């Protein structure tokens, strides 16, 4: 049970606030409510656990490591690629891509989806009649 724990080196997703969608690394624990997080593109600061969603990724680091050490550990663990390839991480990227689509792109996607739906319906009907 409890597949995920808050740990030194645990990678978490910010699920609320202005920093939503960013990956951070838990480098220390202040108390039961907040921890010390870090990432390559921010300053190590505290965050409440209520704004963090633990991921399945973990890196091997000591508490409050240097920026270079943290970056090296993240690169060795390939955190970015692992998160992006996972369905959970791909979900946010796909949501952003859908939000970014323009009118002509939306029309082309509609055409492609209609054609695929028609072909799939024909295929399924043939399978059923088989």
């Amino acid at each position: 049970p409890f597949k995920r724990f808050v740990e030194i080196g645990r990678v978490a997703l910010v699920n609320y606030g202005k920093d939503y969608g960013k990956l951070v690394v838990i480098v220390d624990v202040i108390d039961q409510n907040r921890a010390l997080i870090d990432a390559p593109d921010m300053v190590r600061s505290q965050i409440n656990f209520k704004r963090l969603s633990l991921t399945d990724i973990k890196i091997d680091i000591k508490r409050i490591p240097k920026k270079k050490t943290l970056v090296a550990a993240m690169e060795a663990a390939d955190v970015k690629n692992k998160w992006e390839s996972s369905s959970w991480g791909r979900k946010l990227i796909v949501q952003k891509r859908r939000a970014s689509l323009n009118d002509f792109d939306r029309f082309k996607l509609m055409l492609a989806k209609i054609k695929r739906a028609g072909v799939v319906r024909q295929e399924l009907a043939k399978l059923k009649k088989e």
Binding site: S87, L101, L109, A112, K115, R116, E123
Partner: protein, 205 residues
């Protein structure tokens, strides 16, 4: 609570494991805003404080009666659906035409009677017990309280709900078989359309 703001003919709500008061407030606002609401499985509504406290509260309510003419009220309904209806009426200006019209847009049922057994049923996150009540704290089912205070249809509801759940399980198995067939059809059709799959790839979850 401003309101859902959606435009739909009606909304069916599965009241199972919903706090009575919060669900009542949300639905009262929805009804006042002009929505039509159907609530099912009222017997599965949760009340905080535990069975003992709620039973004492209901007995205190039962004490209230016009001394010279008990038939003049208050009316003490026992069924879970009527309890939910009265709780909602308590949050609506029911003595005005606006409040009466809002009340007239509400339907409450025990269990899932037809045709709502084959209609998609939604939930209210703001009133869900899993989000509102800490595990370990006392709560009681509305159906249990109603049965304790004189509701004698709990067993019939249980039997009918079991039958409906068996039928729904059969339908779900059929739908799963159909879904597997559809995935097979999609795999077969994959090779037929290259460019369409290419355009669709960056959007698929």
């Amino acid at each position: 609570v401003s309101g859902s703001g959606i435009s739909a003919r009606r909304i069916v709500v599965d009241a199972r494991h919903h706090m009575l008061g919060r669900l009542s407030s949300i639905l009262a606002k929805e009804l006042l805003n002009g929505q039509k609401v159907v609530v099912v499985r009222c017997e599965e509504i949760c009340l905080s404080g535990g069975l003992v406290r709620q039973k004492m509260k209901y007995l205190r309510f039962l004490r209230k009666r016009m001394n010279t003419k008990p038939s003049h009220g208050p009316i003490h309904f026992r069924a879970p659906s009527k309890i939910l209806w009265r709780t909602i009426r308590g949050m609506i200006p029911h003595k005005t035409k606006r409040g009466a019209a809002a009340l007239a847009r509400l339907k409450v049922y025990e269990g899932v009677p037809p045709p709502y057994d084959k209609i998609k049923r939604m939930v209210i996150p703001d009133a869900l017990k899993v989000l509102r009540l800490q595990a370990g704290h006392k709560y009681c089912l509305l159906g249990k309280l109603s049965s304790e205070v004189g509701w004698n249809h709990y067993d019939t509801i249980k039997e009918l709900e079991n039958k409906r759940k068996e039928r729904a399980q059969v339908a779900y198995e059929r739908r799963k078989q159909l879904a597997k067939l559809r995935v097979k059809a999609e795999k077969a059709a994959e090779e037929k359309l290259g460019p369409q799959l290419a355009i669709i790839a960056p959007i698929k979850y």
